[PDB]
Structures are given as C-alpha cells and as structure tokens.
Amino acid sequence: PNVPELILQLLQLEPDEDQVRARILGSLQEPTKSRPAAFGLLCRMADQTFISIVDWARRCMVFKELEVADQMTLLQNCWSELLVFDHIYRQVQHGKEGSILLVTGQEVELTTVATQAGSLLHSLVLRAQELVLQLLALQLDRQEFVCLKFIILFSLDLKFLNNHILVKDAQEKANAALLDYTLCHYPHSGDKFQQLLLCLVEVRALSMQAKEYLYHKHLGNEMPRNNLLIEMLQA
Amino acid sequence: PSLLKKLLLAPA
C-alpha cells in the first residue's frame, strides 16, 4: 500500500535518536552553578529535548516557510504537547511497562517514581503510561507518529495566526494524510484515525497537567533560574 | 526580551 507524500517527507526530516541522544548527553557534561544535582540535570535534559524539538520544527516544510511571529505563536501553543508526545513515543518504542526511558537512554523504574516522587509527578507518569498502553494497543507506528507530531505543531485556532491560509492548508493536508494512511494499513479494529485523534485530546490534557507540575515546582523555588521551560510557561 | 525568538533565529 502507498504512503502519503506528506508522511514520507516528515520521515526524512526526523533526526535519528542517536545524534539527538549524543548532543543532549554531551550538553549535560557542561559545567554549571551548584546550590539536588539530579533534579538540575533532569531539568536541563528536558530543556535540551525542547531545543531539538525547535530544531525539528525549523526544518519542517510549512513551518520553515512561515514568518517569525507565526512561528513563535505556534510553538508557544504546542511546546509542552510536543514534549509530552516525545516522551510518550519514546515509551512506545521502549516496550517495558516496569520503567520509563529517558532521552539520555537511562531507565528509571516505576517503583522508583512511586516512592521518590510526589503525588503530582507520580500521577502524571502513571497517566502518561496509560496513554502509552493505548498507543501500543492501537499499534502506533512511525508513519503516524511523524504525522501526529506535525498535526500537534499546527493544531491551533486560526484566529491567532497571521499567515492564516498557509496554516489552514497544513491542517487539512495533515489530517487527510493521517486519514489516508490509517485506512489503507489498519482496517481491522475500528476507526484508527479517530482513535489516534482521541489520543491527541489526551496528550493535550497530559501537557496541561505537565504545565501544572512545572508551576508547582516553580512556586517551590526549586526550579533553576534561566530554565527554558518555565520561561515557556510564562509567555 | 524573548527566548523562543533567539532559538528560532539561530545558526543555520
């Protein structure tokens, strides 16, 4: 069966997980100011994840051909959702329900989260793992993941954008590609396209919960200054 | 003034 052209391009724009892991692992060796040292390392890791996500958005087809005011507005709207989705798909590729995989490749056991994390983080992780299980049951592959990511990037009410017809095109074009792909390849357990969209709704709800967790840490004054994610949290 | 912008308008 054929594959939509928009997906095939999104596949070739995807950075391989090894060079992103090395770049992030390499940036975590750079020295910094002390005052927990692992909490500081995890914040920086998440930060570097968001940088390579911006680097991915910069290379995409419709995003590149967009002026800066619109580029910023899109990313400001979808940043945590793109971070959550990146974590989720990592867990899909990491088929181990007893632990979570980090972008650096280190595994953290769920038992470790359950006794060392607060309720908010632990809730947030368990909820995310529930979505991981549903995506594995729906047999999420890489063609849809790339398509999903591109839908998240542009899934914004068109009022807030200036180069508006360019964006409208993208949304329809990405929905049709995901529709066309799931119909030819997954015709067995119901409306895959619809189920995947229902996942988008859950990724949005997870990303708000994630934003609430950052706000909790922020009120605790435990968040390192200059942190990229809390600066995103405030625009 | 902004951070996102900085990242966006970066090398290459």
Author numbering:
A (entry chain A): 221 to 255, 259 to 458
B (entry chain B): 141 to 152
Question: Which lines from the publication concern this structure?
Answer:
One of the 48-member nuclear receptor superfamily in humans is steroidogenic factor-1 (SF-1, NR5A1), which plays an essential role in development and adult function of steroidogenic tissue. SF-1 is required for proper regulation of gene expression and is essential for sexual determination and development of the adrenals, gonads, and hypothalamus in mammals. Despite the wide variety of phospholipid species that interact with SF-1, these lipids all share a common 1:1 stoichiometry, interacting within the same ligand-binding pocket at the C-terminal ligand binding domain (LBD) of SF-1, as shown by several X-ray crystal structures of the human and mouse orthologs of SF-1 (20).
Thus, all protein sequences were matched between the dioleoyl structure presented here and our previously published structure bound to dipalmitoyl PIP3 (21). As expected, the crystal structure of SF-1 bound to dioleoyl PIP3(18:1/18:1) adopts a 12-helical bundle structure typical for nuclear receptor ligand binding domains, distributed into three layers, with fully ordered helices 1 and 2 typical for the subclass of nuclear receptors which SF-1 belongs (NR5A). Comparing our matched dioleoyl versus dipalmitoyl structures confirms the acyl chains in both structures follow similar paths, with the sn1 acyl chain crossing over and on top of the sn2 chain and the PIP3 headgroups similarly positioned. Indeed, the PIP3 headgroup is in a similar position in the dipalmitoyl and dioleoyl-bound structures, and density for the last two omega carbons of the dioleoyl acyl chains was poorly defined, suggesting the last two carbons on both acyl chains are disordered in these crystals. In comparing the two PIP3-bound structures, the overall RMSD of SF-1 bound to dioleoyl versus dipalmitoyl PIP3 is 0.319 Å over 189 C-alpha atoms, suggesting grossly similar conformations. Here, we observe that helix 11 has a clear shift away from helix 12 in the dioleoyl-bound structure of SF-1, although helix 10 at the N-terminus of helix 11 is almost indistinguishable between the two structures.
